[PDB]
Amino acid sequence: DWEQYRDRVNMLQQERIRDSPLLQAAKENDLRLLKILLLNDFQQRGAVGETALHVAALYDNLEAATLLMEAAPELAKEPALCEPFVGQTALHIAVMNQNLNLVRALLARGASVSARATGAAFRRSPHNLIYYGEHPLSFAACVGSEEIVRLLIEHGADIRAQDSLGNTVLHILILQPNKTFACQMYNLLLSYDEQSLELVPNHQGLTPFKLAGVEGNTVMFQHLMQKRKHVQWTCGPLTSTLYDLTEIDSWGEELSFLELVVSSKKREARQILEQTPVKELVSFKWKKYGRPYFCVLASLYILYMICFTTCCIYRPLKLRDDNRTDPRDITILQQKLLQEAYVTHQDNIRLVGELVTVTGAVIILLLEIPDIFRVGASRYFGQTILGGPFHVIIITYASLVLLTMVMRLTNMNGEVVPLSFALVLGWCSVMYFARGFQMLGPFTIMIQKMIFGDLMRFCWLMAVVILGFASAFHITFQTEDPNNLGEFSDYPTALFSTFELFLTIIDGPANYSVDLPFMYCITYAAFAIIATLLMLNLFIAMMGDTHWRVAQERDELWRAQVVATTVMLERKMPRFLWPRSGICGYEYGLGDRWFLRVENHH
Amino acid sequence: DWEQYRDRVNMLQQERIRDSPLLQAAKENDLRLLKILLLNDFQQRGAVGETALHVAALYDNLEAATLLMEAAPELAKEPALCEPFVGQTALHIAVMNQNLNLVRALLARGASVSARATGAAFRRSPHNLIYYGEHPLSFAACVGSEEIVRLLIEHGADIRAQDSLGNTVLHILILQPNKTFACQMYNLLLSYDEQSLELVPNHQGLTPFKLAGVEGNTVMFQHLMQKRKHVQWTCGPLTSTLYDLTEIDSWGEELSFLELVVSSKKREARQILEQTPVKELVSFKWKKYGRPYFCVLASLYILYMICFTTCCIYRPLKLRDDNRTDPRDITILQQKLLQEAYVTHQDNIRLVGELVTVTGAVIILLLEIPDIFRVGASRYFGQTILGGPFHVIIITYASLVLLTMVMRLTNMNGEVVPLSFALVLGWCSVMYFARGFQMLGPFTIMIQKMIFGDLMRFCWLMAVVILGFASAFHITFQTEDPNNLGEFSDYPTALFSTFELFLTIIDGPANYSVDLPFMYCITYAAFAIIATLLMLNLFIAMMGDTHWRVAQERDELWRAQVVATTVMLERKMPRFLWPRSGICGYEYGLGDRWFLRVENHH
Numbered sequence A, B: 001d002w003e004q005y006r007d008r009v010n011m012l013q014q015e016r017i018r019d020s021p022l023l024q025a026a027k028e029n030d031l032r033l034l035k036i037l038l039l040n041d042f043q044q045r046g047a048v049g050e051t052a053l054h055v056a057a058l059y060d061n062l063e064a065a066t067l068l069m070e071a072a073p074e075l076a077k078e079p080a081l082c083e084p085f086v087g088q089t090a091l092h093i094a095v096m097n098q099n100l101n102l103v104r105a106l107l108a109r110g111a112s113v114s115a116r117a118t119g120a121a122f123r124r125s126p127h128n129l130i131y132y133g134e135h136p137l138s139f140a141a142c143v144g145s146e147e148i149v150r151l152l153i154e155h156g157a158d159i160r161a162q163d164s165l166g167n168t169v170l171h172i173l174i175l176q177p178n179k180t181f182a183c184q185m186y187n188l189l190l191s192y193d194e195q196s197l198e199l200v201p202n203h204q205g206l207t208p209f210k211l212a213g214v215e216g217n218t219v220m221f222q223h224l225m226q227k228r229k230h231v232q233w234t235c236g237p238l239t240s241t242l243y244d245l246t247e248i249d250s251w252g253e254e255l256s257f258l259e260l261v262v263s264s265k266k267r268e269a270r271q272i273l274e275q276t277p278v279k280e281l282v283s284f285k286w287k288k289y290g291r292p293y294f295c296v297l298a299s300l301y302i303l304y305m306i307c308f309t310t311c312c313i314y315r316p317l318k319l320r321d322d323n324r325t326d327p328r329d330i331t332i333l334q335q336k337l338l339q340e341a342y343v344t345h346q347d348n349i350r351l352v353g354e355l356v357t358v359t360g361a362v363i364i365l366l367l368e369i370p371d372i373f374r375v376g377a378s379r380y381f382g383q384t385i386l387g388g389p390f391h392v393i394i395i396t397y398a399s400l401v402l403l404t405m406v407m408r409l410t411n412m413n414g415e416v417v418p419l420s421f422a423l424v425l426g427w428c429s430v431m432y433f434a435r436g437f438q439m440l441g442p443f444t445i446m447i448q449k450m451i452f453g454d455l456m457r458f459c460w461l462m463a464v465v466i467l468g469f470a471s472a473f474h475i476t477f478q479t480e481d482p483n484n485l486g487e488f489s490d491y492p493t494a495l496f497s498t499f500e501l502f503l504t505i506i507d508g509p510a511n512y513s514v515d516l517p518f519m520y521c522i523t524y525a526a527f528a529i530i531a532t533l534l535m536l537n538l539f540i541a542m543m544g545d546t547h548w549r550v551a552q553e554r555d556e557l558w559r560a561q562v563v564a565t566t567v568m569l570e571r572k573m574p575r576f577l578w579p580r581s582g583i584c585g586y587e588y589g590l591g592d593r594w595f596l597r598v599e600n601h602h
């Protein structure tokens, strides 16, 4: 694994540094020994191809570093050579240690301002504790060393240079955790912008502005917006400001800023939706257009589920064509064949409801399947904010409807099976629309967070209790007459009875007209204590405990689900239903831009 | 919508200011350009009829404003002209910007101290972030600018002037959010009162004192009471104070201060009921008169419900007059007709209970219907503090009793229907009286806050689960013999069974003497996990979470419901039962006033 490899790399590196007297002296700064070694081979390299000057820079030894450079000035030009540290110069190290005196002394000797630390130890990854990109300028920037940043830009640091992710120094500052200084650095770098560096995309296509949204960097987002706003007037406690929406609303771009924020996997990204140009924009879009269209679509879907349900209630059945010879058989009706299922006026009235039913299942797949391939199947089905679990069950619903159509046409028996799944999944998919309503929306997120959290843990331990007790109850009744207590009469019935007895959805077996096994009363007392009293009530206790701790995040997830719904509706619906949002600049002489005006009290 | 209109107004305003070189110079303060333009048409107006001097005042440019006034002194007199800003002078703007030097310079040039900003941007509304009324003095006051307030009063600001709501500067200060400075301003304005300005009503009929109650301004209320109290004595740690009740008790006034506070829709208004002249007054009224009369009325209503119930238990029925030919029919009795329903001594004893029952339903409507028209139907039925939901069900109860009387008299069949509603609603309306008792009162507010909150959200998602599963269970059993498992034998029974199975109020279907469908055991396992375990227990978890967060407001709502009951009883009951409260001043030589004396430890 990578941790064991990095560890060896570090161990071999320290071993070489102890083995070589020149690298050893570069780490210890014993200028006596180092002068004698240099007066007496300067190319000597550690375990990763690093020079004695990289070693002096790593241990921050300016005296050893200047002796090494005075003896062999060419060392200032050298990269490290091996897979972890490829391209790392003594200048990258001196910059990361903030040694301005060593950085000057290296630049005075031709150390490259444009060198790229291409090795893995520099790549963005979960493996690496930092990500400064690849260049001395990007290091000095993320390190928060203006004096080094100016010194490098003077010496030719290309400010528009890009690393292996395509990230410029501006993209890299958006990724750093000192969000507050990163701003002062962001302004220092834009003081040399003179296409703007603000508009350069990385290889994901993200500009710095889109990256601050995607990464949830709310401090850099609100800092970037201070240069995309104009104060129209202030009068007493009131100010009117005009925000340029060109970045946030992303008109006619192939993937918008708000899509990138709502689909981001960072929990910090949802906080961007609470910021001033945005909250007001997504709130305007939702009241004016989003909620009216979502209430119409919710109503049409519920009427379509009533239509589908009615085609199940009036499903085509006839009297069985053979006798119930087994006294335990209760089936009295059978399917009509296709050639007899459409004969009466009521069958033709149903056929309209069935063709509407099938048409809705086709339309569901025509609307769903393309969005799997844009968003990505895992995000499509995994993301709570995008509706992931409802996209699974609506595709499953439409698939079970189309399977039921193929079964009808082919005279295949057993349409009850796909229709029973399609009725449960079809109606529970009406919970998709709960996200538009402040009453139902946050509660539907508790249902989801309780299903995947507490109900899953409960069902795993509930299963071993049911297997223990269903087996004990089955073998207790194995020897007794099945007609006197039917609940445990075979292992599948004993499992199902024990599951219903666990949840108290059926009454505990009892027949006072006969002597039940004494081992049953012992086993059922232990079961009612463990299953019913302790665990079924411990479920309520752990749900009540989960609920107060999740209640803040559920509201944030709901406020984000409303924005994701707003963004979905505007991307999918015909534009004539969704007029461009905000204020057109052109009819007021402001040029091609579109704006949001907000008035605030202070 | 108004937001899009205000936004255009702001955009057209800024466009004109950029288009006109004179308004542009008034905003930028480039005295070079402005001197040349004025030396070279001074009437030029922006998008809302505002002058270049309004523009200089808005951008707070005293140098541009004094050049514009020096070139054309008549500009100081000008209002703005268009619908948002009608009547707004440069003096309104200079006052709101607190520019005392510009305000003098305008007043020195005849700017009107009595101008009214009649435009909508000044009206009280949810659309407007501030409300300063219409006059320069009311602006200077709400802005908290004594030096400008004195300067205006010297120049003739009519302190008794009223805006389009009838609000004086005192009413407007009660509405402002800096409740603490507003007091220092309130005293500054009363220093010029010399009918008192304290007693002038707005167009709602509210004086400043009633408005501080209605708006829940507890800081201004307790400040107003410092001038309506007298300290009789202090001895060591004890003080005795005498509060004038003339304002709070509002004797013989058509609508009292305490009615206006308990019927207010502001959540802050209930906090007035916790203040020193009041809490002691409403507590005295409740112990001495309120609770004794409310316990008598509670007892009389419960005895009337026992009387009505007894007329239902002894309802007049006879043997059916035709055979039960359908083997699934269980009806054996039928109504007696009016001409046979009153024959025995026990029928005449009932008839007294029925005439008492009907008389109580008439009395309920005679007591209820007038109060709908005073309070207003929406407040009458909407307000928790006034008893809103109990006023709905008591009017509904009386209507179902009078309908049942019309049915009896007309020999109409089916009296079971209106009587079953009248028994449920009649007895649940006994919960109205829970508000008098500290044990039952706050709990009856949780019942209400759980019905309209958590039970509503639950019932919406519970309904789609019941529609999904009732349909799956119905079509699973559609083909099987109805006599072996009756629960899902038609769609209305399948809905009702699935509702009872959701809540575990009936046992899960099972008949071990026959092979049930395998799809039933699959569907019922999924149902018991989703309905019974997860959601029925998630109801308890979300109620437990709502309960601790609502528990403070429920106690405040209960303490306010007791005062609303006290105020109701005193307004409705015969005065001889409700002696005037407090201490008559006349028999101690204090004149016509009535007082509350409170003794306090400090």
Ligand SMILES: CCCCC/C=C/C/C=C/CCCCCCCC(=O)O[C@H](COC(=O)CCCCCCCCCCCCCCC)COP(=O)([O-])OCC[N+](C)(C)C
Binding pocket: A456, A459, A460, A461, A463, A464, A467, A490, A491, A492
């Ligand atoms: C997110 C939570 C997920 C939790 C997942 C857990 C699920 C709960 C239960 C598992 C379903 C097991 C279904 C067994 C059906 C047997 C039918 C049958 O064929 O029975 C028996 C055969 O087998 C048995 O004897 C026993 C089967 C093996 C033991 C039970 C299954 C264990 C499954 C373990 C799963 C992992 C659990 C780990 C901890 C969670 C035959 O039938 P018979 O009884 O008529 O005997 C006919 C013959 N005589 C009359 C002579 C008796």
Ligand SMILES: CCCCC/C=C/C/C=C/CCCCCCCC(=O)O[C@H](COC(=O)CCCCCCCCCCCCCCC)COP(=O)([O-])OCC[N+](C)(C)C
Binding pocket: A302, A306, A309, A310, A313, A314, A315, A430, B456, B459, B460, B461, B463, B464, B467, B490, B491, B492
């Ligand atoms: C604050 C919370 C408020 C929540 C409100 C929600 C309410 C829960 C349930 C709704 C009541 C529906 C009553 C249906 C009665 C049908 C009787 C009948 O006539 O059935 C059927 C006819 O209809 C049906 O087939 C299906 C009816 C349509 C679907 C069910 C109603 C959907 C209502 C949706 C409401 C909105 C929900 C949105 C999400 C909350 C006939 O009768 P049969 O079965 O004897 O068939 C006789 C004929 N064979 C023998 C051949 C079968």
Ligand SMILES: CC(C)[C@@H](C)/C=C/[C@@H](C)[C@H]1CC[C@H]2C3=CC=C4C[C@@H](O)CC[C@]4(C)[C@H]3CC[C@]12C
Binding pocket: A389, A390, A393, A420, A421, A424, A425, A428, A429, A431, A444, A445, A447, A448, A449, A451, B472, B522, B523, B526, B527, B530
């Ligand atoms: C035999 C059939 C009837 C069984 C398998 C059916 C399972 C249904 C009842 C289960 C399967 C997954 C469940 C499920 C998945 C996830 C979510 C998202 C959550 O935010 C709301 C509840 C909701 C929508 C629930 C509802 C109930 C579902 C849809």
Ligand SMILES: CC(C)[C@@H](C)/C=C/[C@@H](C)[C@H]1CC[C@H]2C3=CC=C4C[C@@H](O)CC[C@]4(C)[C@H]3CC[C@]12C
Binding pocket: A459, A460, A462, A463, A466, A492, A493, A495, A496, A499, B517, B518, B521, B522, B525, B529
């Ligand atoms: C406790 C958790 C883990 C939940 C999920 C466990 C469910 C188990 C107990 C349930 C789910 C589906 C049930 C089930 C499916 C269908 C049938 C066919 C029926 O003719 C006999 C019972 C039988 C065989 C039962 C046995 C018990 C099962 C397997």
Ligand SMILES: CC(C)[C@@H](C)/C=C/[C@@H](C)[C@H]1CC[C@H]2C3=CC=C4C[C@@H](O)CC[C@]4(C)[C@H]3CC[C@]12C
Binding pocket: B389, B390, B393, B420, B421, B424, B425, B428, B429, B431, B444, B445, B447, B448, B449, B451
């Ligand atoms: C068919 C009939 C019997 C059905 C419709 C009757 C409904 C009754 C049970 C329901 C309807 C509204 C409910 C209701 C409304 C509001 C309140 C106010 C609350 O502070 C206490 C409970 C209380 C008083 C409850 C009691 C139960 C009521 C009165």
Ligand SMILES: CC(C)[C@@H](C)/C=C/[C@@H](C)[C@H]1CC[C@H]2C3=CC=C4C[C@@H](O)CC[C@]4(C)[C@H]3CC[C@]12C
Binding pocket: B459, B460, B462, B463, B466, B492, B493, B495, B496, B499
């Ligand atoms: C889950 C929430 C939404 C609550 C309110 C839902 C209630 C539903 C399930 C209940 C309320 C009243 C019930 C109801 C009313 C009366 C009858 C007549 C009876 O002869 C057959 C059942 C039938 C038709 C049932 C069906 C199920 C209903 C409609």
Ligand SMILES: Clc1ccc(CO[C@H](Cn2ccnc2)c2ccc(Cl)cc2Cl)cc1
Binding pocket: A295, A298, A299, A302, A303, A430, A431, A432, A433, A434, A437, A439, A440, B460, B461, B464
């Ligand atoms: Cl789980 C679930 C999901 C969505 C709805 C949709 O609920 C709304 C009503 N509502 C309830 C609360 N706030 C709004 C609705 C019901 C019926 C029809 Cl036909 C249209 C609409 Cl818009 C109900 C349950």
Ligand SMILES: Clc1ccc(CO[C@H](Cn2ccnc2)c2ccc(Cl)cc2Cl)cc1
Binding pocket: B295, B298, B299, B302, B303, B430, B431, B432, B433, B434, B437, B439, B440
């Ligand atoms: Cl929901 C409800 C509402 C009101 C009462 C009234 O309860 C009181 C008794 N009580 C109980 C607690 N504190 C006082 C009562 C009962 C019977 C009779 Cl006849 C008269 C009275 Cl005054 C009881 C339930």
